[PDB]
Amino acid sequence: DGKINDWEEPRLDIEGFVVDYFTHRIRQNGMEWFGAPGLPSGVQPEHEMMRVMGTIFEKKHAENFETFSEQLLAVPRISFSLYQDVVRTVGNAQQSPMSYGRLIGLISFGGFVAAKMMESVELQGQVRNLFVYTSLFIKTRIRNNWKEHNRSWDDFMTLGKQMKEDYERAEAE
């Protein structure tokens, strides 16, 4: 029933999380998305965690990242329906519509495609659209869920910190 949650705060707009991770993943390819919109308050702590998880994720779950990217890029112009078709499987299989897992997966996969798209001025100007589709697809699912399923960015942050360590802990064994 109530009053102004994490995800409803301006500084946590999901678009900020997306533009950022996209800008990030793209740099991890030498490329630089000059078209990226500007972040109203620069990179946020919660943005950094996304990069981490988004990184952990692309590794351990890169399964269909190139199959799906294929489906998405096999068309002159990417769309929202096509985008929804491809991604209704990333992050979850056979559940809350937006678990931290699905969120991460979608942003992770989005950033991945963002890079491929950049490696070709023909499929470039569409990173902008992929940014929109990714933002909206998550937005409407965090909408009437996170509150009743007891999710929030602070919680994500708490869970992200542990996953970050538990992962770097194993990277040296």
Partner: protein
């Protein structure tokens, strides 16, 4: 159903509503005044969050209510007169003291934070801060400010490929602190670049998605089999919740986009290369051409972005500027290409341009295309059969000359006479800024360097010959100033050029 003004009020009140408005407090009451049905109430009361409820509440109110009265009354009925007065004030100002409304009512509530948020959510590209062509950026701002109260309009920022329209558009919107927030309630920036038949349709499918970015999109409709009328009706429906939106249509090629924008009665900032598309409009049209950077402007550019600042050393710089032809896109393709900071390696480039085209100074700057050339290709492919030919024979001509018609009427293929060469030449300057001209003392046309460098390596050199020596047959049958009729006798004044082929 509310009107835009009544919706702007609600929008302006948002900040206040998020602080102490609980949509449930108003349900029994509005059901009582026959504005809400029990269903509207459950659609609203069911949302798990207060902001969620406020959002559902406002969509139904804009649809069902026919004025703000019921909502104003409700707030006094619930002892929240601070909210009811704000809405009552807004409206009283809007009707009786406009142009005071923004100063007194709207502006007071708005921070750079809110402005930079609108930009993010609007998809506006990050503003370039290094060089800021102030003149143009403020022209846009001034015009967007004087037009902001028209129901709909078209502000055309037109110019040659790379002139810097987009950069400017972004700067004008990011630089001002009034426009997006005070003049307009929000913004939607979308890149067109459409060329296919379904391009405009795809463009407007996104606009629709854009305007409903805060609606339930769980079952958003696939639009693969939806008609244009339906797409429009859906966009119009969504518009009620988004009053005073500024739509920026970046890189418009097809006049279809202008037509759609007009049917939808949008307030638009369009960036294009072909100003002739504005002819599709019946709406109020305004213009601002992004001209080539002056001689001293290229310097300001070269300055902030690294390059030194100068006897024979100056010359070398002046040559870049001549080859760059004032095109910010090309000028930038230089910086990233000149590894050193020596006018030497700089000269290296200049020469390579004089030796390969522009493909030499190929690059990977923040621009879209590898070479300004590929960017010009499209402009060429959208021209008429005749024009594309006339533009081809302009190869055989000196870059940077104020050569009059009769002189052009030679190489350009075609009671009345060759006033038509003038017509074709007037179109190549309108649809791509491929050429240019001056009214007096005597009408003439010119072809800049970069556009000449382009034209060179694009036509089977067997066409240059056939022409260069087809002028070599028109010269025999008959300085910073224009050669008088007695001069079109010779083409040797420009021989260092007409022969270095």
């Amino acid at each position: 159903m509310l009107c835009e003004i009544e919706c702007r009020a609600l929008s302006t009140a948002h900040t206040r509503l998020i602080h102490d408005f609980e949509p449930r407090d108003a349900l029994t009451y509005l059901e009582g005044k026959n504005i809400f049905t029990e269903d509207h109430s459950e659609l609203i009361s069911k949302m798990s969050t207060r902001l969620e409820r406020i959002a559902n509440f406002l969509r139904i109110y804009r649809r069902q209510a026919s004025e703000l009265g019921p909502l104003i009354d409700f707030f006094n009925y619930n002892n929240q007169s601070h909210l009811a007065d704000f809405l009552e004030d807004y409206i009283d100002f809007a009707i009786n003291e406009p142009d005071l409304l923004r100063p007194v009512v709207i502006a007071p509530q708005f921070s750079r934070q809110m402005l930079d948020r609108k930009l993010l959510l609007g998809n506006v590209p990050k503003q370039m801060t290094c060089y800021i062509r102030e003149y143009h950026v403020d022209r846009v701002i001034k015009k967007l400010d004087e037009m902001c109260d028209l129901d709909s309009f078209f502000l055309f920022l037109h110019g040659r490929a790379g002139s810097g329209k987009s950069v400017i558009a972004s700067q004008a919107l990011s630089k001002s602190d009034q426009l997006i927030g005070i003049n307009y309630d929000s913004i939607v920036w979308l890149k067109d670049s459409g060329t296919a038949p379904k391009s405009t349709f795809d463009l407007f499918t996104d606009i629709l998605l854009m305007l409903k970015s805060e609606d339930d999109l769980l079952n958003f409709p696939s639009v693969e089999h939806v008609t244009s009328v339906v797409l429009k009706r859906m966009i119009c429906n969504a518009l009620i919740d988004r009053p005073n939106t500024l739509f920026v249509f970046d890189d418009v090629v097809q006049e279809e986009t202008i037509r759609w924008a007009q049917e939808l009665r949008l307030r638009c900032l369009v960036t294009t290369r072909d100003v002739e598309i504005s002819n599709a409009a019946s709406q109020t049209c305004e213009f601002i051409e992004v001209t080539s950077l002056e001689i001293d402007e290229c310097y300001d550019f070269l300055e902030a972005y690294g390059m030194p600042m100068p006897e024979k050393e100056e010359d070398v710089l002046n040559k870049t500027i001549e080859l760059s032809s004032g095109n910010p896109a090309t000028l930038m393709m230089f910086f990233k290409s000149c590894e050193p900071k020596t006018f030497e390696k700089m000269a290296q480039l200049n020469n390579k341009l004089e030796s390969r085209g522009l493909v030499g100074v190929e690059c990977i700057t923040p621009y879209s295309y590898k070479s300004l050339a590929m960017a010009l290709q499209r402009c060429v492919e959208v021209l008429s059969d005749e024009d594309r030919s006339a533009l081809a024979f302009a190869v055989v001509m000196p870059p940077g000359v104020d050569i009059p018609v009769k002189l052009w009427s030679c190489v350009i293929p075609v009671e009345q006479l060759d006033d038509e060469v003038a017509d074709r030449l007037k179109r190549l300057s309108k649809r791509g800024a491929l050429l240019s001209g001056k009214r007096m003392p005597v009408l003439t046309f010119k072809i800049d360097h970069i556009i000449h460098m382009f034209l060179k390596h694009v036509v089977d050199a067997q066409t240059i010959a056939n022409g260069i020596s087809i002028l070599e047959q028109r010269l025999l049958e008959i300085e910073t100033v224009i050669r008088p009729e007695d001069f079109p006798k010779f083409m040797q004044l420009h021989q260092k050029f007409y022969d270095s082929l």
